Design brief:
- Chain D: Belongs to the RNA polymerase beta chain family.
- Chain D: Keywords: DNA-directed RNA polymerase, Nucleotidyltransferase, Transcription, Transferase.
- The structure is cut from a larger assembly and holds 1 copy of chain A (95 residues), 2 copies of chain B, 1 copy of chain D (681 residues) and 2 copies of chain E (229 residues).
- Chain A is mainly alpha-helical and 95 residues long.
- Chain A has a single domain, classed as Eukaryotic RPB6 RNA polymerase subunit (Alpha-Beta Complex), CATH 3.90.940.10.
- Chain A has helices spanning 5-11, 15-31, 59-67, 81-91, and one strand at 73-75.
- The longest helix of chain A is centred in the first third of the chain and has 17 residues, at 15-31.
- Chain B is α+β, with helices and mostly antiparallel strands.
- Chain B is elongated, with a radius of gyration of 17 Å.
- Classes of the chains: A mainly alpha (95), B alpha+beta (37), D alpha+beta (681), E alpha+beta (229).
- Chains in contact: A-B, A-C, A-D, B-C, B-D, C-D, C-F, D-E, D-F, E-F.
- The interface between C and D is large, with 140 and 133 residues.
- Bound molecules: magnesium ion and zinc ion.
Chain lengths: 95, 37, 621, 681, 229, 229
């Protein structure tokens, strides 16, 4: 199947929450730029024509791999709706 | 052709958000700036 | 009609994993055309978008670099597949495409059950999730390997089908051969020696009804696990033979095959001791033993870990199936001699009924109704006859193992080849007076055929008319039930239903335990309305009762401590449009509590519409 | 009532030539009622097959008639029956109406007979629709033949007798879908009507009276009768069948040859030698492979493709009209206005494509030209044209190209200008241009083959002759059929054919097992006995005995109960063989397959590929004018329907967006699908 | 040598032509004949190379589905007959040889009617190409090549003459392999494997030659286990 | 080299001890991984020589089913434990070596309690032979030999001492072989064989060493096809 799916399911209160989180996370992973991730370091996304998944294959496979770590935070009302898109634009550049 | 009332279309999860600790600090730096003069 | 779709003939993809499915590259191409176009541009293959388009307008103009591109685009994306009548949610599952050459679409064997699909030409359609969200849901909650347990019953649907069982079975069943002289090893030391040499001779088999150890156990003892199979490889012991082996702790008298099965699972999931806990190597492994294996593996080890074992079983089953050399042969359908006697016995028994009528004793009718019960009994007699034959003389008959294995075979079917199929009904419904004495093995004659034909069409026409009504039943059930959805917080209205464990009138009035299955149907994954102290354990209030708990309550009622059970149910929910977590229960496709937001309404409506196609339909009212 | 002839193959057309439908005038039987009509009635005997009806909604209402069943002057299916006078049977056959048949006590042909005598005291007969055990003194009439009970189409089945009437239907209908193979073979085992099917049908070309052969062209056999006269008999070389199957008459008689009155001069589309032939007899092992034959999959040996065994020629006519528009006639020329001459190569004759040209998807089959926009097309694009290079020829490229899916080689073309022959062109129609194209369809994994019994299935894998199951003597099996498909369904007849076949292979002979009187288990075990000597006899003389493997499998055979313990391996294998199964080694390991496995000459045909077969796949494409939903077109495939049942499937899951997608971006969201595409891009 | 090494596989051969060749090898320890015979068989059928008709050119015919007058056999039958034609060249210098043939009138055309070529030999002389009645024209150019395996006419595609038509490639020289492992008796220990594999060949190459190539492909493959990583 | 020869079997290894060792080798043309893996396996289990306990002698015990007092473990368990004992001699001169051991009283007997032998080494020292409480007699003579494959105690039969009991022969240092043939992708042609065979070993020899021996036994055997007759 797909990496720690159970581990993932366990993080959320609802199944359908783990779908919303990953989907929205993948959204922004493209929009603000792709390096928005929190895990470029030692071991991260990879593909083999050459190992280059490091740039833009599957957004969603990333989101999950990050969410499986404890860096992201998904709340019902975490950060004010419009003001986020503004500060994310400011900090994450190749749009 | 509207979103389904049931599923992800749940009002329970329609609205959800994700943030990196990096943007966490950024958003309240915005709040710190709220201090006038 | 959807914009990114496509359909072709499907074909079994044995090596393929649950996870994936083989999709024709040629199809992937115009399927993922726009997605390819830009990665074309992202790499030197083409300067741009319109360039890339004309670059692919023809077939001969494709550089093999393009495939490399397409394959790269499809890296972690998944498509949806859909069979002919979509009857339940699983009638559409998601998988990872593994581009392949040719026209046909490679489908995994295990999911062939979910979509009723055989490979006689059934074609499956395929769609593509375009938004990042659409794919998110598609592979998280709609991929195949994530939905292993049925929404109808908390019983596995990824159950080793026709071949896999057949295989996994043959490897684990033990054999028995000849009792000529004494079978007493249990006590004499002269018995171990004498019957060890006598076995060396031609009188005692390696497999003999000796109660503690047949000389087969006497001769061979294997220290380490591997040791056992090596001897097998060298032609010392066959897999189905009875020998003695040493595991983690005690000397276990178990055959080679059964010991190998152990490893297969033990390896599938490495938690070797957790592998031994949930398996029964004490028996040949039927579809049920496996179905159970899957289930508990699903509850104990985890979803994906389960998927693994599934393909693991799939692979060895298929393999060992090929080697076993099981094959149908005219001589394999064995006709019991007993047939001639049971026939001849009911034969004269008919003469008497005619001798009775010829006198004036029995009414026109009485004769008829008496002759029919003559056959209906005689026929059922030959049927236990044939099986007993196989049971005692040919444990490994080809025809028979498929039937006794979760694999292909029906008791009333075997009867038409080895025994005989005899009573066929007239056009109207009044069965025929004369039976069909022949079997399929021997010439079903000219007439007996015609006679049987009548009942054929009524069934064929029945399937066609119910086939559309299974659609009838569903529409009506979804029209009423669609709005119903799990939206909640434990609805506070505690009004509950009590599930009976005993039935009144089968016989006038005697109280008795309801059917195991039925009871499971009533309490599985339910939420206890009020606490119940039963056999020693204190079932907590609101606790979701696992299958294991519904197994305790039954043993308890067996003992005599409970006759009903307090459980929250949709029948009594407060939430006007909707149903809550506590009132629904467990069964999401997952065996955990129901997740808020599941479209229960439909999930229900479907589970009742599909089976519907199996129920007889003569006239509505 | 009148419909396209179905000539997938002759047998077919024959059937469609004589099938009695319910539905029609409307006065007789509309579809509303049916269950009483749909069922088989006691009278349907010898009058209508009980097997031929169509699987599906329309069942029991549409059906072909029986073997001898014939319409007396006014439409009452009656049939032939002999006259048995006392305990004496006769040849005077009475074509008896349906009604008169009830007045007499009729008997079945299966009744032991010496010539004119009836041989057993209690012997079956049937008064009126009801089976009755009558005495030789009451037998007034007897059945002509078991054959008159069913239809032609069914009578072609070997041991119909051992097959469940339900899946024998499948067998009957399957032959109706048999595709003519360049290499046609008759069945190793036939019923007996193959011969008269091709003759009553008009497949092969027979000889009027006796004589000798003058010329034997690939296109004509001018025979010369002994009457002092000679006639030229043309042969429909390669003709298109309404459905697209090849109908070629290919000679079978050499120059200067004796001709029997009524002897095959040329064979029909599918006849080998006057015999009906569809599909080819192939040696088959009946066991389980990896999963390659899991529910109903067929594993095939590459070796079958090496030989030109399952191969069939196809042909399709592409047409295009030169239309008369008020904007200017659609010229049909070699001129293709906008980009390359590389495409014009095969457009040899100016305009049409050259014969013998290899046309692949997307090549110009024909070219035509129409005008677009009114005088001033694009204000922006007119600028671009002035800029980069003013090459102004305002005509549009509307040219018949090869639709996706495929074409082959062009074999014939027809160009009917406005109308001077004796052809009337439709109004507006300036001229028509057809282009017949043909192609070879090799056997491949997508294809579907099925024996006459009913075993239907699709090729899942083409294995290298290198590793599939091979017999002791190096001859390997061509196709590996999965046992499991035999118990559920009930047609042992296929397992009986395979057996009789095994004999026919080593005995180099073919047989004819009638419908219910044919071969009988002892006679077949007998032929196998003769076979054992050709298979193992030569083995003795050639120099060698039995393998370690061969003995090993015998060990797992006696422990099984197929061989009488104590006998010798050469005697044990004979036993084993008589049972129809022989020892087989893996091929991919050399080791043997624990336990004997049956193998033999089973006849298997290949089925016709519908226009569906064409694996559709669509990205983006046309849309409908009023309802804007994806629409199948000339150079783009057309979308798949997402129906209610499929909606609920997703509804059931939490697929919220995926379902929204299916209803918006992918099908109806006009602005959606556009911004969708671009975004993806 | 005298004891363990002199007791060595006695390679014995029995070859009667280029088509059949038996090969016995007899003391082999335990389950070795199998270990040997099987791989060799697998090699013997897939890896050995040979010759096959790769292209054809009838001078007045344009497509493969054409019927030629005076000729009883249609192009599809003839091109088929050619597939069964077996040729043999003697050296690498001969990669692609074009055989030529033209027969007019009343004679039955056979494979030997092809004009001889220096280093090429036709083992299939009496094969039947066609039957010409009178005014029977037949002028064809058939290309022959040396390759391996099966190659569909659709995969290569010939380019001799624009009106020529490709044909399917039937390359393996080996027709069938068979190997038997029967016990043999050696002084004190009876358990012994005896491998005798029988090879059949179209004639292009010989059983012995085939086998030799076989064993080398195996050896070459066993060397590929040299540089770890 | 660059095209067909540089595209050569990339022999990759993953060995993490002397017991387990993976071996991958891809691209292999068609159905070759199988043609290779199968024989090698067959060799890996039968041909590679080793050492196993072939005979035992307890001084007061007469039959194998005897129970010895003071000793918690019955003869059948101990003779079983001995099958798990792995020894290694350094040279041919050592065909049959008899290891000796006697322990009295309260100590737990282990494989190291065996009196050392000049050219023999016990790799299985801490293995557990038995538990002696007090007045515990234990004087045993265990015969060790070097052979190949599996040999049932019934097939050989001990002749050391009349009261001795034979043991089943655990010889191949290799415990289990496994080879997988999964497809691999190479540019143009997809059909490709990838062979990765996993070898397990008791520790005596190594997976790599085993495999190498294996391949040579095959090669050596391929040469026995040299002198016809
Ligand atoms: Mg089907
Ligand atoms: Zn509630």
């Amino acid at each position: 199947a797909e990496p720690g799916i159970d581990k993932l399911f366990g993080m959320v209160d609802s199944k359908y929450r783990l779908t919303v989180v990953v989907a929205k996370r993948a959204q922004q992973l493209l929009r603000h730029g792709f390096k928005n991730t929190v895990l470029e370091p030692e071991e991260r996304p990879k593909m083999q024509t050459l190992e280059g998944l490091f740039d833009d294959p599957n957004a969603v496979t990333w989101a999950m791999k990050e969410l499986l770590t404890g860096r992201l935070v998904f709340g019902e009302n975490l950060v004010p709706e419009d003001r986020l898109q503004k500060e994310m634009e400011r900090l994450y550049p190749v749009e | 052709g509207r979103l389904i009332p049931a599923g992800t279309g749940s009002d329970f999860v329609r609205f959800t958000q994700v943030v990196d600790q990096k943007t966490l600090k950024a958003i309240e730096e915005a709040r710190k700036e709220a201090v006038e003069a | 009609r959807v914009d990114y779709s496509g359909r072709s003939v499907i074909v079994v993809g044995p090596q393929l994993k649950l996870h994936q499915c083989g999709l024709p590259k040629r199809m992937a191409l115009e399927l993922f055309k726009p997605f390819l176009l830009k990665k074309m541009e992202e790499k030197g293959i083409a300067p741009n978008v319109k360039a890339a388009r004309r670059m692919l307008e023809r077939q001969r103009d494709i550089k093999d670099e393009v495939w490399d591109a397409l394959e790269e685009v499809i890296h972690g994306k998944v498509v949806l597949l859909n069979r002919a009548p979509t009857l339940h949610r699983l009638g559409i599952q998601a998988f990872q495409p593994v581009l392949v050459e040719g026209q046909s679409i490679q489908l995994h064997p295990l999911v062939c059950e979910a979509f009723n699909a055989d490979f006689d030409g059934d074609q499956m359609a395929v769609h593509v999730p375009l938004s990042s969200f659409a794919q998110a849901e598609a592979r998280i909650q709609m991929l195949s390997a994530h939905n292993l347990l049925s929404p109808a019953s908390g019983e596995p649907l990824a159950k080793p089908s026709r071949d896999i069982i057949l295989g996994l079975y043959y490897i684990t069943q033990v054999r028995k051969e000849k009792k000529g002289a004494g079978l007493e090893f249990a006590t004499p030391e002269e018995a171990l020696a004498a019957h060890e040499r006598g076995e060396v001779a031609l009188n005692a088999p390696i497999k003999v009804a000796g109660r503690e150890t047949s000389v087969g156990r006497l001769k061979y003892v294997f220290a380490n696990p591997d040791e056992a199979l090596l001897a097998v490889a060298h032609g010392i012991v066959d897999l189905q033979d009875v020998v003695t082996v040493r595991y983690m702790g005690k000397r276990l008298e178990t055959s080679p095959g059964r010991i190998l099965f152990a490893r297969i699972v033990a390896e599938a999931v490495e938690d070797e001791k957790v592998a031994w806990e949930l398996i029964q190597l004490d028996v040949p492994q039927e579809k049920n033993s496996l179905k159970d294996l899957v289930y508990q593996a699903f509850l104990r080890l985890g979803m994906e870990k389960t998927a693994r074992l599934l393909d693991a079983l799939k692979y060895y089953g298929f393999t060992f199936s090929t080697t076993s050399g099981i094959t149908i042969g005219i001589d394999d359908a064995v006709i019991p001699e007993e047939k001639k006697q049971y026939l001849e016995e009911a034969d004269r028994k008919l003469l008497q009924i005619e001798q009775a009528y010829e006198m004036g004793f029995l009414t026109d009718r009485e004769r008829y109704d008496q002759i029919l019960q003559l056959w209906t009994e005689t026929t059922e007699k030959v049927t236990q006859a044939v099986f007993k034959n196989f049971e005692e003389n040919y444990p490994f008959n080809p025809l028979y193992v498929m039937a006794q294995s979760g694999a292909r075979g029906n008791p009333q079917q075997i009867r038409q080849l080895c025994g005989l199929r005899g009573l066929m009904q007239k056009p109207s419904g009044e069965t025929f007076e004369v039976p069909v004495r022949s079997s399929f093995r021997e010439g079903l004659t000219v007439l007996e055929y015609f006679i049987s034909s009548h009942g054929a069409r009524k069934g064929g026409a029945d399937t066609a008319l119910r086939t559309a009504d299974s659609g009838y039943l569903t529409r009506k059930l979804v029209d009423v039930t669609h709005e119903i959805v799990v939206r909640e917080a434990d609805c506070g209205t505690t009004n509950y239903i009590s599930v009976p464990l005993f039935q009144p009138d089968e016989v006038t009035r005697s109280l008795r335990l309801r059917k195991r299955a039925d009871i499971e149907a009533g309490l599985y994954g339910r939420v206890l309305a009020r606490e119940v102290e039963v056999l020693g354990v204190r079932l907590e209030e609101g606790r979701y009762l696992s299958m294991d708990d519904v197994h305790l309550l039954i043993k308890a009622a067996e003992a005599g401590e409970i006759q009903e059970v307090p459980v929250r149910s949709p029948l009594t929910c407060q939430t006007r449009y909707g149903v809550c977590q506590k009132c629904y229960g467990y069964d999401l496709s997952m065996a955990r509590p129901v997740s808020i937001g599941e479209a229960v309404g439909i999930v229900a409506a479907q589970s009742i519409g599909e089976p519907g196609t199996q129920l007889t339909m003569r006239t509505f009212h | 009532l009148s419909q396209f002839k179905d000539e997938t193959n002759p047998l077919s057309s024959l059937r469609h030539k004589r099938r009695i439908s319910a539905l029609g005038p409307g006065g007789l039987t509309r579809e509303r009622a049916g269950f009483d009509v749909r069922d088989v009635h006691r009278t349907h005997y010898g009058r209508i097959c009980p097997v031929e009806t169509p699987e599906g909604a329309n069942i029991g209402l549409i059906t072909s008639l029986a073997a001898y069943a014939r319409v007396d002057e006014l439409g009452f299916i009656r049939t032939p029956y002999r006259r048995v006078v006392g305990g004496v049977v006769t040849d005077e056959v009475v074509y008896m109406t349906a009604t008169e048949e009830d007045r007499y006590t009729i008997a079945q042909a299966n009744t032991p007979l010496e010539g004119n005598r009836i041989a057993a005291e209690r012997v079956v007969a049937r008064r009126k629709g009801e089976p009755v055990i009558v005495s030789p003194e009451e037998v007034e009439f007897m059945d002509v033949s078991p054959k008159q009970v069913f239809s032609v189409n069914t009578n072609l089945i070997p041991f119909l007798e051992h097959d469940d009437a339900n899946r024998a239907l499948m067998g009957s209908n399957m032959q109706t879908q048999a595709v003519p193979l360049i290499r046609a073979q008759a069945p190793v085992v036939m019923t007996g009507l193959e011969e008269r099917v091709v003759r009553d049908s008009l497949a092969a070309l027979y000889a009027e009276e006796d004589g000798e052969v003058a010329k034997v062209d690939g296109n004509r056999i001018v025979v010369r009768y002994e009457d002092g006269r000679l006639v030229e008999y043309p042969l429909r070389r390669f003709y298109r069948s309404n459905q697209g199957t090849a109908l070629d008459q290919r000679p079978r008689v050499v120059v200067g040859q004796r001709v029997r009155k009524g002897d095959l001069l040329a064979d029909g589309p599918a006849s080998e030698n006057g015999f009906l032939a569809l599909g080819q007899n192939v040696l088959v092992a009946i066991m389980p492979f990896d999963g390659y034959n899991f529910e109903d999959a067929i594993v095939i040996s590459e070796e079958l493709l090496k030989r030109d065994f399952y191969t069939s020629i196809h042909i399709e006519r592409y047409e295009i009209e030169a239309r008369d528009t008020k904007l200017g006639p659609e010229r049909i020329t070699r001129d293709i206005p906008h980009l390359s001459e590389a495409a014009l190569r095969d457009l040899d004759e100016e305009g049409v494509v050259r014969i013998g040209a290899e046309v692949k998807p997307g090549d110009i089959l024909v070219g035509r030209t129409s005008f677009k926009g009114e005088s001033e097309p694009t204000p922006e694009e007119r600028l671009l044209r002035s800029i980069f290079g003013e090459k102004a020829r305002d005509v549009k490229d509307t040219s018949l190209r090869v639709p996706p899916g495929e074409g082959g080689i062009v074999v014939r073309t027809v160009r009917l200008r406005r109308g001077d022959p004796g052809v009337e062109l439709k109004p507006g129609v300036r001229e028509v241009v057809r282009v017949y194209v043909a192609q070879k369809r090799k056997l491949q994994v997508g294809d579907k083959l099925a024996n006459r019994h009913g075993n239907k299935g699709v090729v899942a894998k083409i294995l290298p002759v290198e590793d599939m199951p091979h017999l002791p003597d190096g001859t390997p099996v061509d196709v590996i059929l999965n046992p499991l498909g035999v118990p559920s369904r009930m047609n042992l007849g296929q397992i009986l054919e395979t057996h009789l076949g095994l004999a026919g292979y080593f005995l180099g002979q073919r047989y004819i097992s009638p419908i219910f009187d044919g071969a009988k288990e002892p006679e077949i075990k007998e032929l196998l006995a003769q076979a054992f000597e050709v298979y193992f006899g030569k083995r003795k003389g050639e120099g060698f005995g039995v393998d370690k493997r061969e003995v090993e499998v015998l060990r797992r055979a006696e422990k099984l109960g197929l061989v009488t313990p104590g006998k010798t391996p050469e005697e044990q294998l004979k036993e084993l063989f008589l049972q129809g199964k022989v020892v087989l080694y893996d091929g991919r390991t050399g080791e043997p397959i624990e336990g004997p496995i049956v193998v033999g000459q089973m006849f298997i045909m290949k089925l016709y590929h519908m226009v569906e077969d064409k694996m559709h796949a669509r990205s983006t494409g046309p849309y409908s004018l009023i309802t804007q939903q994806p629409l199948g077109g000339k150079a783009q495939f057309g979308g798949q329907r997402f129906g209610e049942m499929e909606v609920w499937a997703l509804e059931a899951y939490g697929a919220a967006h995926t379902l929204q997608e299916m209803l918006t971006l992918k099908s109806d969201d006009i602005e959606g699908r556009n911004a969708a595409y671009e975004a993806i891009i | 040598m005298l004891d363990s090494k002199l007791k060595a596989p006695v390679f014995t051969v029995r070859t009667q032509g280029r088509e059949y060749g038996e090969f016995v090898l007899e003391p082999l320890e335990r389950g070795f004949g199998v270990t040997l015979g099987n791989p060799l068989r697998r090699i013997l059928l897939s890896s050995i190379p040979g010759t096959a008709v790769t292209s054809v050119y009838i001078e007045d015919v344009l497509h493969e589905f054409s019927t030629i007058p005076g000729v009883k056999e249609d192009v599809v039958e003839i091109i088929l007959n050619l597939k069964e034609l077996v040729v043999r060249f003697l050296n690498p210098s001969l990669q692609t040889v074009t055989l030529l043939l033209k027969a007019e009138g009343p004679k039955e055309v056979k494979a030997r009617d092809f004009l001889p070529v220096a280093d090429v030999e036709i083992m299939n002389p009496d094969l039947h190409i066609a039957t010409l009645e009178e005014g029977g024209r037949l002028n064809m150019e058939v290309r022959v090549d040396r390759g391996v395996g099966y190659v569909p006419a659709e995969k290569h595609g010939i380019k001799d003459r624009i009106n020529a038509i490709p044909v399917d490639a039937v390359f393996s020289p080996v027709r069938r392999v068979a190997f038997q492992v029967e016990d043999t008796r050696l002084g004190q220990r009876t358990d012994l494997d005896k491998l005798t594999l029988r090879i059949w060949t179209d004639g292009s190459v010989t059983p012995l030659e085939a086998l030799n190539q076989a064993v080398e492909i195996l050896r070459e493959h066993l060397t590929y286990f040299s540089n770890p990583q």
